[PDB]
Write a protein that binds this DNA or RNA. Structure first.
Lengths: 200, 93, 38, 60
RNA sequence: UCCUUGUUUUGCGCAAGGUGAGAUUUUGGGCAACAGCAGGUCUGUGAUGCUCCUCAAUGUUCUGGGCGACACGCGCACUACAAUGUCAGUGAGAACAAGAAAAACGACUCUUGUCGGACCUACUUGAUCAAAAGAGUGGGAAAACCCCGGAAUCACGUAGACCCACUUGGGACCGAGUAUUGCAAUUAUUGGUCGCGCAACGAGGAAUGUCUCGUAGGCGCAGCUCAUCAAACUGUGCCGAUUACGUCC
RNA sequence: ACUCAACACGGGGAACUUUACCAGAUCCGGACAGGGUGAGGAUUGACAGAUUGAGUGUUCUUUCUCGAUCCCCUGAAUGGUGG
């Protein structure tokens, strides 16, 4: 229906926002959910799945419980799982979090960003970009670019390949902005718009 | 107020707590099934008072509040009741 | 009317197709499944 | 304005300094520095070691 | 692509015609590099530095009332209605359109785990006597909603009426009545009656705007906002040209 | 906001609400008791009377209903459509 799709949008929004704030620096990619008929799997994409669960088991049932108490869900209609994402490099948001941590620790912008770039471009990524605007001086609102490999912004097709993350760091004097992109070496449309090949 | 009594119970054997931020009353719970009737404002006040003592941990999304009860919070709560317990979060599972 | 994802009630409320996402603008607050292609 | 002189030096706070123990003198003084900066360190200044450093606070 | 076997020194290509639904960035949109601006936004935010308001708080209030809308007839920006004979002005009848909107309240009733009321439209009473407007039955979560789609531009000589006038062309002021909406109306209401029209204005100085095709122009409908009102904004459809297809002043 | 990248623009067709602003009253949100008042407290709730636009229970009197959270002093604080 009209309303179904909208309400699904709402549910995803609320869920995604709750996690992406309050559970962070675990290499959080995001979440994905699907129905199994009167139950919803709701897998949680993280690099480190141990913090998601908890070693006391409190975390996973807290996050189930918060959802239940809001939406009037009950057990056996709701569930939460963990999923191991290998290569934190290929997750925009995950790299974003680790970078944010470096900056809040009061480490150098250059050194920090170079860490992200090294990590990403090792796993075979086409390109990456780290655009950190904000304070680093005063008195500017200076913007620093770091650009690596190659990246496309052409078409609407680019949006599917390239996942993006924007986050904030909060420091003395005020806000510092952070952004990470990362063009994946593996398509999510299974499509390219360049290089006609010849099979010999 | 005698109102606050009901909410002092609401902490216990309900795990994580949830509220909506509103200036106008509405029942915070749903999951616990206790069905206390309390205005939201009062609930919020108590949540905040013992957040300031480090007992409770706050987390927030959009306009909603979700309050988790720490190890410390559990300990305190058990003493304030008198009633010893095997720790609120870990009992449920 | 009034809004449920702010309490501002000003800076304009969408109530089209039973949703509010214009007291927090939808360009910033996406993942409702909408896209622009045309 | 012929007179408004001394405006700033009226208003400012006076701690009126703070007590301190006597310092080494003669060779003893020169000793004191040569130990601090050039020994118990991996570096000699240079600007590589900074002789005075201060804590943070406020930034603009 | 072919062809003109033209133009093409060979190339990159160009023009006309042809096949053809369609002749070149196929057509219309959408996205878009680098360098930036002391552009706008701290009344979008749980996005924020500091330092102001922090209780005769100014913060804050389902609190009450008022403002943002005022009127020397003052300037500017944008909009809409006209001065009519190329809907032309009051009357009647015919044929005929397309996206899109809609529903669900812990409120009642229902049971061993729970159903119908805030959306529309149909039909009939609303004329043994108006409009506005009352109410009952009936269906829909939409390719179901009664033909899913209709009345404006248009057509019409039915031998309609007016007829070259500031009128019977236009409305804007102004008074009286009533019903509808709402937590509350103080022309809020306005799809309504019926006064004033013989109040303006006759295509309107200088100046200046933007479009080469199903476009311009003309016309209507829905969505949007939401106690209630659209000359606004957004989208769909209908009627549908003149000139140019060149140059760089 | 003010040549253009102002001026049917701030999805801004605002009457009470929205509200910055004005005319007045109110709340604790001032939480946090570490320095004080438990019973009978500065209190929660309250008919009448009064207060005042507001029989409104804020307030004050009467008398009743009282948890001792509300209340007292500092520090601390949070909230804001303020720049």
């Amino acid at each position: 229906k009209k309303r179904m799709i909208i309400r699904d949008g709402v549910f995803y929004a609320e869920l995604f926002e709750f996690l992406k704030r309050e559970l962070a620096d675990d290499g959080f990619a995001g979440v994905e959910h699907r129905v199994t008929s009167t139950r919803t799997e709701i897998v949680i994409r993280a690099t480190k799945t141990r913090e998601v669960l908890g070693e006391k088991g409190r975390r996973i049932r807290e996050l189930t419980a918060c959802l239940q108490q809001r939406f009037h869900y009950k057990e056996g209609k709701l569930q939460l799982f963990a999923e191991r994402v290998e290569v934190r490099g290929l997750s925009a948001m995950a790299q974003a979090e680790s970078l944010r941590f470096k900056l809040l620790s009061n480490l150098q912008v250059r050194r920090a960003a170079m860490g992200i770039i090294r990590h990403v471009m090792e796993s075979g990524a086409k390109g990456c970009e780290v655009t950190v605007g904000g304070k680093i001086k005063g008195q500017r609102a200076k913007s620093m670019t770091f650009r690596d490999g190659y990246m496309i912004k052409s078409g609407t097709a680019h949006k599917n390949f390239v996942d993006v993350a924007t986050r904030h760091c909060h420091l003395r004097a005020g806000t510092l902005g952070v952004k990470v992109k990362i063009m994946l070496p593996k398509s999510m449309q299974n499509e390219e718009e360049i290089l006609p090949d010849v099979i010999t | 107020k005698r109102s606050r009594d009901d909410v002092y119970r609401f902490f216990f054997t309900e795990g994580v707590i949830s509220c909506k931020k509103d200036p106008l009353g509405t029942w915070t719970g749903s999951l616990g099934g206790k069905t206390f009737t309390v205005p939201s404002i009062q609930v919020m006040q108590l949540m905040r008072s013992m957040k300031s003592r480090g007992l409770i941990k706050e987390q927030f999304a959009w306009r909603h509040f979700y309050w988790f009860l720490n190890d410390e919070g559990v300990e305190y709560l058990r003493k304030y009741l008198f009633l010893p317990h095997d720790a609120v979060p870990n009992t449920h599972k | 009317r009034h809004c449920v994802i702010c309490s501002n009630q000003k800076a304009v409320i969408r109530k089209y197709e039973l949703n509010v996402c214009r007291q927090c603008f939808r360009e910033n607050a996406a993942n409702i499944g909408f896209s622009k292609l045309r | 304005s012929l007179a408004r002189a001394g405006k700033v030096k009226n208003q400012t706070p006076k701690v009126a300094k703070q007590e301190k123990k006597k310092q080494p003198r003669g060779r003893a003084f020169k000793r004191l520095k040569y130990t601090q900066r050039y020994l118990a360190k991996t570096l000699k200044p240079g600007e590589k070691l900074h002789m005075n450093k201060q804590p943070p606070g406020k930034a603009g």
